[PDB]
């Protein structure tokens, strides 16, 4: 009787339909752990859409799943993806979205080098979506390069809300462990209370990324990393050599063991560093069909 609750509930919030009879060529193109990304074809217009596609027995905690479409609907942005229609199909939560052709951010720091303005320019994207986010109280508590998604023309858009949370004046902070494991903020990890700043810390894990590759800890076990993040120091770039003394300065209020020193959104967009962004086109270069 769990179960049939739960579909019910979320029957109330979605589009109501079945959006298999205007679609056409479903082509799976991704799997996470929510569940698999499919493209497909509104065949009434020839336009092409992203359908995520998840099932509701096979979920760690079933009450996020609203997430998947309240966070889209509520907050329309340049930098944030495009919802179009949420369906209940089976026993599968299905939204239908925007498909940004140039992929994740991850297929790009894993195989070439970004530079300092092309870095630049996702940093503000981001910052510019959490700034409007945080505002409201809500946390994402998942930034990192897979939830990062990409034009053709390099534009830069916050994807994959399944993980986000609400605070407010009754409820201040969060207390549940929730996130990618090695962006994870110290204080989440330790247990404590958190707010918006975790977000904060897990771009700057991120700009890691752009820079090294790959977070720090990387390596170690996620079990094993997440205790390394908390007894230890903010992290240190491998290639500390390559970055600018802006850049670094820029990181520097990112990477705060104590969330109230660690930098804010708002803060963070009036920062020097961000000056560098270039335009859209200066992502093009780095995706996986130009390179
Ligand atoms: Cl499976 C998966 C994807 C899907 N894989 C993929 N490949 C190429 C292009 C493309 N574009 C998209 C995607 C979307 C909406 C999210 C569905 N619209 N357009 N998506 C992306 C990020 C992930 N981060 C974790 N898992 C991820």
């Given at each position: 009787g769990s179960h049939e609750q739960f579909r019910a509930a979320l029957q109330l919030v979605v589009d109501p339909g079945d959006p298999r009879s205007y679609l056409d060529n479903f082509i799976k193109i991704g799997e996470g752990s929510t569940g698999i990304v499919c493209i497909a074809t509104?065949?009434?217009?020839?336009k092409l859409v992203a359908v995520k596609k998840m099932d509701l027995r096979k979920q760690q905690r079933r009450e996020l799943l609203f997430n998947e479409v309240v966070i889209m609907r509520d907050y329309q942005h340049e930098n944030v993806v495009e919802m179009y229609n949420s369906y209940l199909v089976g026993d599968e939560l299905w939204v239908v979205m925007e498909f940004l052709?140039?992929?994740?951010l991850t297929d790009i720091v894993t195989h070439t080098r970004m530079n300092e303005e092309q870095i630049a320019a996702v940093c503000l994207a981001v910052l510019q979506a959490l700034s409007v986010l945080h505002a409201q109280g809500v946390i994402h508590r998942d930034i990192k390069s897979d939830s990062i998604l990409l034009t053709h023309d390099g534009r830069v858009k916050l994807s994959d809300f399944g993980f986000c949370a609400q605070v407010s004046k009754e409820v201040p902070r969060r207390k549940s462990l929730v996130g990618t494991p090695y962006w994870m903020a110290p204080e989440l990890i330790s247990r404590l209370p958190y707010g918006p700043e975790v977000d904060i810390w897990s771009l700057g894990i991120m700009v890691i990324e752009m820079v090294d590759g790959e977070p720090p800890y990387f390596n170690e076990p996620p079990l094993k990393a997440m205790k390394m993040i908390r007894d230890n120091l903010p992290p240190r770039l491998?290639?500390?050599?390559?970055?600018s003394p802006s850049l670094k300065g820029f990181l520097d209020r990112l990477l705060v063991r104590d969330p109230a020193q660690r930098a804010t959104a708002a803060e963070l967009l009036?920062?020097?560093?961000?000056?560098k962004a270039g335009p859209p086109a200066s992502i093009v270069p780095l995706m996986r069909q130009n390179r």
């Open positions: 509104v065949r009434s217009s020839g052709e140039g992929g994740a491998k290639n500390l050599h390559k970055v009036k920062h020097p560093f961000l000056a």
